[model samples]
Each structure stands twice: as structure tokens, then as C-alpha cells.
Target: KTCENLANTYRGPCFTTGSCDDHCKNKEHLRSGRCRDDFRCWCTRNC
Candidate 1:
């Protein structure tokens, strides 16, 4: 199944998906991430 969650380690505005992806992978250890329109980082993974 696919899972998505708010990245707790990511703070402030999300400017780019690339940065969000990096944070999710490196910090949260998720598969990937996206920059939401609300400027939040949402991480995704297969669970």
C-alpha cells in the first residue's frame, strides 16, 4: 500500500519538491516527498 505523512523533521516553507524529497529520504527515511501548496513537506512511502 501507499502511505503519506507529514514530515516532522521539515520546517518552514517548502520551495521545491527536490528539497522535500531529500529531507524525507535523509531525515525521515521515507521513499520520497512533495511540496504541498500550503508550503508543507509531505513524505510518501510503500508500506
Candidate 2:
């Protein structure tokens, strides 16, 4: 159920599963594991 180019875990407001409805574990890649390459996050802009 992963969207975007995120790794390991899914990205964005992931749909609910059961009791976790509407609660998209608002964390930076912690939904599954650390980001092996954080610079690629969709939110990232050219800096």
C-alpha cells in the first residue's frame, strides 16, 4: 500500500487499516524504518 518513492514504509496520509483510521503515523519515515535516502522525499525542494 505504499505510495510515492518512499522506501521500506509507505508515504503520505496512508489510508486506515483498522483502529488506525485517519492516523497516518505522522512521522518522517518512521512508519516502517529510517530513510535510507531522505533527500529524495517528495517534500524536498531544490536547495
Candidate 3:
């Protein structure tokens, strides 16, 4: 996967639907792309 950092569910194709965290998948420079209910971003595990 590409190393991307962005705010999830922020109205964009590159952002995931969930919380607007600063990190994802245990990577500080990475952002998840998991969509929850097509509008909310969901971040699974921490590791």
C-alpha cells in the first residue's frame, strides 16, 4: 500500500471513513481507507 497521511472522512477519495486520527495501521505516516456505512471512517486494530 502507498504511504499516505490524511484525515479520514474528510470528504475526499484518499481519506478513509472513520476517526480523524494522525496515524493508521500502527504507522504514523499512513492513513487507512476503510469506509464505514459509506460515510464514516473506521479504524480497526492498532497493530
Candidate 4:
């Protein structure tokens, strides 16, 4: 299964999912990320 969490290091508004995905995968070392309805970056990973 997968779990979603807010990207703690992500600053400012997230304009796209790709940027968020990169940040989560490379920086946070998670699976991926998405730009949620709140315009915040939410990272996804194995739970």
C-alpha cells in the first residue's frame, strides 16, 4: 500500500505535479508527489 504526506521541505505554492514529484522523490526520497487542491505538495510512499 501507499501513504500520502505533506512535503515538509516544500516551500511556496506548487504549480505542477512534476516539480512536486521530483522534490519528493529526490529530496524527500519518497515514491512520488502531487499538487493537491490546496496547491501544496503532497508526497507519496510505501506505507
Candidate 5:
């Protein structure tokens, strides 16, 4: 799968998928984002 990656900043921790998704769009200009194993924000797109 072709995927994208992103990071949480001083903006704070993103625990919810929706929030992370918005963060991805605004912060990284990604399509979407999600919370990962390490409680970090990540963005991905399947290709």
C-alpha cells in the first residue's frame, strides 16, 4: 500500500481518529490521519 506519514506537534496529543484526521489536513496537508500504536499521529492513503 502507498501510504503517507505525519507527526503531532506542540499542538498536543491526538487521541481520536477524527481529530487526527483534521490535524493531518491542516498540519501536514494530508488526506487523512489516525492514531497509531505509539499514540502518535499518522496519515495514510492506500494505493
Candidate 6:
């Protein structure tokens, strides 16, 4: 992981993988992301 909370998609304390992926790629310029606890999206890339 990149150790960054790049974006948030927690309108209802939930997130979609597809949307998070887009947000990480388009907004954060990252490879991808996964939804973590507290409805947080952590973006990551190949190290």
C-alpha cells in the first residue's frame, strides 16, 4: 500500500470496488484501491 487515504466514498459507510478503483486511478493517479475499515479507500501501486 502507498500509505495514503487518497479518497473517500463513504456516503453510507460503504464503498464499491469499481468506484474506488476509478477514484484511485483518475483522482489519485494510483493503480488501484481497496475499501478498508471505517469506509476508507486506500490506494496502492506496485512497489
Indicate which candidate wins on TM-score.
Answer: 4
lDDT of candidate 5 at residue 9, scale 0 to 100: 55
Per-residue lDDT of candidate 3, residues 1-47 (tens digit): 34433334355443444343433444433445355444443444434
Stretches > 4 Å off in candidate 4:
none
How badly does each model clash, as a count of residue pairs? 0, 0, 5, 0, 0, 0
Compared with the true structure, model 2 gives a TM-score of 0.16
Q: Write the per-residue lDDT of candidate 2 for residues 1-47, one digit (tens) a residue.
A: 43433332344433324212212234332232322334322221122
Deviation in Å, model 3, residue 37 alpha carbon: 0.8
TM-score of each: 0.85, 0.16, 0.27, 0.93, 0.61, 0.57
Give, for candidate 5, the lowest lDDT window spanning 10 residues: 5-14
RMSD of candidates 1 onward, in order: 1.0, 11.2, 8.5, 0.6, 2.6, 3.2
Please give the range of 10 consecutive residues that has the lowest summed lDDT in model 2: 15-24
TM-score of 4: 0.93
lDDT of 1 by residue, 1-47 (tens): 87988889887889899999999999899999999887889999999
Compared with the true structure, the alpha-carbon lDDT of candidate 3 equals 0.42
Candidate 2 overall lDDT versus native = 0.31
User: Which residue segments of model 1 deviate by more than 4 Å?
Assistant: none
* lDDT tens readout by residue for model 5, 1-47: 75867654516666888878777778777777888766678876566
Candidate 1 matches the true fold with a TM-score of 0.85
Better model by TM-score, 1 or 3? 1
lDDT minimum window of 10 residues, candidate 3: 14-23
Model 1: clashing residue pairs?
none
Best-to-worst ranking by lDDT:
4, 1, 5, 6, 3, 2
Stronger candidate by lDDT (1 vs 5): 1
Clashing pairs in 4: none
